[PDB]
Structure formats: C-alpha cells, structure tokens
Amino acid sequence: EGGPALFQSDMTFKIFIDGEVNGQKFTIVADGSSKFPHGDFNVHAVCETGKLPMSWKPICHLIEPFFARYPDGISHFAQECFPEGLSIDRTVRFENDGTMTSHHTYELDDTCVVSRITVNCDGFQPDGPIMRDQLVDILPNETHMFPHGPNAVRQLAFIGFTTADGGLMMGHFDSKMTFNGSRAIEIPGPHFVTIITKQMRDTSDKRDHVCQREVAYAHSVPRITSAIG
Amino acid sequence: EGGPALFQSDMTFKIFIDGEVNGQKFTIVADGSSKFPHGDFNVHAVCETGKLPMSWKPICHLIEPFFARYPDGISHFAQECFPEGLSIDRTVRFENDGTMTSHHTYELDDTCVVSRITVNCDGFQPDGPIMRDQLVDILPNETHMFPHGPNAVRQLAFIGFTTADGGLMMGHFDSKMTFNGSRAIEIPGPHFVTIITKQMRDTSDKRDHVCQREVAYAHSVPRIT
Ligand code: NA
Ligand code: NA
Numbered sequence: 001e002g003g004p005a006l007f008q009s010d011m012t013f014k015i016f017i018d019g020e021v022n023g024q025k026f027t028i029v030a031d032g033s034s035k036f037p038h039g040d041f042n043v044h045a046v047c048e049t050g051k052l053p054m055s056w057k058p059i060c061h062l063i064e065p066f067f068a069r070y071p072d073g074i075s076h077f078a079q080e081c082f083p084e085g086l087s088i089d090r091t092v093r094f095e096n097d098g099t100m101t102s103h104h105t106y107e108l109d110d111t112c113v114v115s116r117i118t119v120n121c122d123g124f125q126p127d128g129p130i131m132r133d134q135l136v137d138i139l140p141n142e143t144h145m146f147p148h149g150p151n152a153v154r155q156l157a158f159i160g161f162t163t164a165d166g167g168l169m170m171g172h173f174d175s176k177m178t179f180n181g182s183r184a185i186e187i188p189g190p191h192f193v194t195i196i197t198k199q200m201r202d203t204s205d206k207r208d209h210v211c212q213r214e215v216a217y218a219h220s221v222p223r224i225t226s227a228i229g
Numbered sequence: 230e231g232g233p234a235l236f237q238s239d240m241t242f243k244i245f246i247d248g249e250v251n252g253q254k255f256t257i258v259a260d261g262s263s264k265f266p267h268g269d270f271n272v273h274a275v276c277e278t279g280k281l282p283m284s285w286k287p288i289c290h291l292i293e294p295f296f297a298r299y300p301d302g303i304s305h306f307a308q309e310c311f312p313e314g315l316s317i318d319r320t321v322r323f324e325n326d327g328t329m330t331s332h333h334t335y336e337l338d339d340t341c342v343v344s345r346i347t348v349n350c351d352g353f354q355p356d357g358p359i360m361r362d363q364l365v366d367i368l369p370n371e372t373h374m375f376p377h378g379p380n381a382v383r384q385l386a387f388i389g390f391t392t393a394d395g396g397l398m399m400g401h402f403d404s405k406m407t408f409n410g411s412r413a414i415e416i417p418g419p420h421f422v423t424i425i426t427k428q429m430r431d432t433s434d435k436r437d438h439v440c441q442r443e444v445a446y447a448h449s450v451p452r453i454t
Contacts, residue, residue, distance in 0.1 A: 142371030
C-alpha cells in the first residue's frame with residue numbers, strides 16, 4: 001500500500017528544531033520511541049542553545065502524527081505518506097499575543113523517523129505568560145482532521161494552556177500535512193485525533209530539557225441517518 | 230428547585246429567530262421536544278417569511294445546549310443556568326465567506342424552553358457555496374468547552390460543511406454562554422460536547438419546512454500519570 005506496513009514495528013524518532021522567538025534564535029533537539037501499536041510515546045527534548053527563552057509548553061506540538069494510534073477503518077495518512085515522507089505547514093495563533101509558524105519535514109531512516117522543523121515565534125508579549133514561563137499545563141484536545149485536495153490533510157485544533165493565575169491561554173492551531181510523492185494516496189474522511197500531553201522534568205538530566213508523553217488516538221463519530229444507526 | 234432538577238422530565242422547546250442575510254430579513258419559528266435523559270432530539274424548523282434566503286445548513290447551530298446528555302462527573306452549565314436562564318453570544322466565521330453573529334436568550338416555561346434569537350449574516354459571497362445552497366452534509370464535531378470567568382462558558386468549534394464541488398467550507402465557531410443571574414453558579418472545567426446533526430427539508434408548501442436531528446453529548450478525555 002504501504003506506509004502502515006513500515007510502522008508495524010517499534011520505531012525511534014529524532015527531532016531537530018531550528019527556532020526564533022522575538023529575534024532570539026534557539027535550538028531544540030529531541031529523541032524518543034514508539035512501541036507498537038503506538039499512540040502512547042515519550043520524547044526527551046533538550047535545548048541546545050542553553051536555556052529556552054520561553055515556556056516549554058507551547059513547544060509541545062513541535063516535539064509525530066504517524067505515531068498516533070489509528071483505528072482499523074480510518075486511513076492513517078501520516079503513515080501512508082512514507083517512505084517518500086510528508087511536509088507540515090503549521091500556524092498557532094495565540095489569542096492576544098504571538099503567532100507560532102512552523103515548517104516540518106519527515107524522512108524515514110529505517111525504523112527511525114527524522115524530523116526537521118524551522119519555527120518562528122513573533123509578536124509574543126515579553127511580559128506575557130509564554131515569555132515569562134507562567135504556563136502550568138497543556139489541556140487535552142480533540143483535533144479535527146479534514147481531507148484537503150489530492151495530496152493533503154488539514155488538522156485544526158484549539159490548544160489551551162493553564163496559566164499560573166489560573167486563567168487560560170488559547171492557541172488557534174491550523175496544520176497542513178502534505179504528501180511529498182506524486183503518486184495518488186488515500187485521503188481519509190473527516191475524523192478526530194484526541195491528544196493528551198504531559199510535560200515532566202527528569203532529575204537525571206542536568207540540561208534544559210523536558211520529557212513529554214503524548215497519548216494520541218484517532219476516532220470518528222457515528223453519523224446519523226434518521227435512525228441511525 | 231433549579232438546574233438539572235428542572236430537566237428530570239420530558240420537555241418541549243420553542244425558538245424565535247429574527248434574522249437577516251445581506252439585507253434580506255427573515256423570521257424562523259422552530260419547535261421541538263426532547264426526552265429524558267435528552268442528548269438526542271428533533272426540531273421542526275419553520276420559516277414564517279416563506280423562503281429562507283440562504284442555506285438551512287449554517288442555521289443548524291441556531292435551531293438547545295441544555296438538551297445535551299451530560300455525564301455525571303461534568304457539571305451541566307446550560308441546565309444549571311435555570312430558572313434564571315442563559316444568554317449566548319456567538320460568532321461563526323466562514324473561511325473565504327460571511328460571518329454569522331447571533332445573540333440568544335433562553336427562558337424556562339415550566340417544562341418548555343423559549344429561545345429568542347437575533348442573527349446577522351454579513352459579508353457572504355453572493356455566488357458562494359452558502360447563498361447558492363451548495364452545502365451537502367453538516368460534518369460532526371467535538372466542540373471544546375472552557376470555563377470563561379465566574380459566570381460563563383466558552384464553546385469553540387470547527388463546523389465543516391461539504392460543498393457541491395465535493396470540498397469543505399469551514400466555520401470557525403466561538404460562542405459565549407453567560408448566566409443571567411447574580412446567584413452563584415458552578416463552572417465546569419474544560420470538556421467537550423460531541424455534536425452529530427442531520428438535516429432534512431420536510432414537505433414544502435408556502436414556507437420552507439425543515440427537520441433536524443441532533444445527537445449531542447459531553448465527555449472528558451484521559452489524563453496522564
Ligand atoms: Na477514511
Ligand atoms: Na465539572
């Protein structure tokens with residue numbers, strides 16, 4: 001078919017993030033694993049440039065759609081896309097402050113997916129909860145997957161973050177995933193992928209790092225036909 | 230006695246929509262019932278000005294949040310608002326198209342809920358998918374509910390409609406539900422309400438007649454560690 005074939009074993013992945021927040025460059029490298037059947041995976045992320053000038057929380061969606069556990073009967077696009085891979089173009093528009101714009105590419109290196117991401121963060125308030133690291137947790141969410149022309153899928157999401165003063169920071173996530181090949185590919189119908197994300201500190205690592213576990217799984221909701229069933 | 234105690238019965242409801250779309254005034258008088266434990270209900274939507282001048286599709290959300298089946302661990306704000314009732318302010322932004330701004334009030338009549346809605350449909354493309362009635366299916370969605378201050382909840386959603394050309398027109402839905410009381414009211418934490426709707430264009434006479442079914446229920450999602 002046959003991308004899903006390749007992902008039937010336990011994979012590794014490596015992430016290279018080249019970023020810019022308010023004219024200030026930063027670099028994040030990450031690695032982790034996803035044991036079959038997937039949909040529950042951990043990543044260790046380190047800031048190469050010493051200290052991250054912002055909250056690690058908004059970085060969560062940067063540090064693997066092919067690792068979400070999909071169901072039998074919904075087509076797993078991210079996985080279909082290999083070996084030739086896929087690009088992602090993504091904007092996160094945070095209400096009353098900055099926009100995160102990223103470009104991703106994914107290559108398959110045996111049982112290792114290599115991810116290369118440039119990210120720009122502009123218009124972020126230097127006093128705000130993101131720059132001042134006042135973000136407490138990442139809200140779970142129901143992202144919405146929509147077929148998009150012949151080579152793409154579109155992921156729309158509301159990503160919310162709890163602040164220190166108990167309020168809420170809301171990002172408008174819009175993410176295009178484009179298949180790199182020219183061959184026809186199966187494009188899944190409208191569905192959902194649920195994403196729950198927790199960021200933790202490992203006492204082991206002295207570096208500016210996070211460990212991050214994501215539980216992600218796809219699902220659909222039964223359409224009604226008057227009765228329906 | 231307030232809140233969900235009022236909803237422990239079977240119930241009807243009534244909707245009055247005063248609207249306009251790029252000038253064209255229209256009134257809708259929808260009516261329906263919902264049956265304990267609710268979460269699945271029908272509405273009979275009747276235009277009192279004859280022809281609805283745009284698709285009936287984007288009107289789905291206009292034609293009952295208290296009729297969602299809420300599980301036990303999740304506070305049902307829409308119901309807790311009663312008797313005092315609830316007001317709603319709602320914007321829906323269509324990519325490359327117009328914006329529905331609506332304002333709803335709700336009032337309890339023992340076991341009947343009265344809905345009073347105004348809605349401006351503006352900036353809509355005169356030849357686009359909505360005005361040309363080119364939208365086939367209303368896609369289902371997982372609306373996101375968030376606490377919004379001491380007396381409100383915010384509902385965010387992407388409401389997709391499939392077009393004639395087979396593609397999808399996307400609505401960015403932002404709706405603020407505010408308790409109209411001074412009394413203290415529980416605000417639920419972040420959750421979701423799954424909404425599934427099916428629309429049908431019931432036997433046509435001097436008026437646009439429309440039937441709609443909606444399954445709608447609230448849920449949380451897992452948490453880690
Ligand atoms: Na599919
Ligand atoms: Na609750």
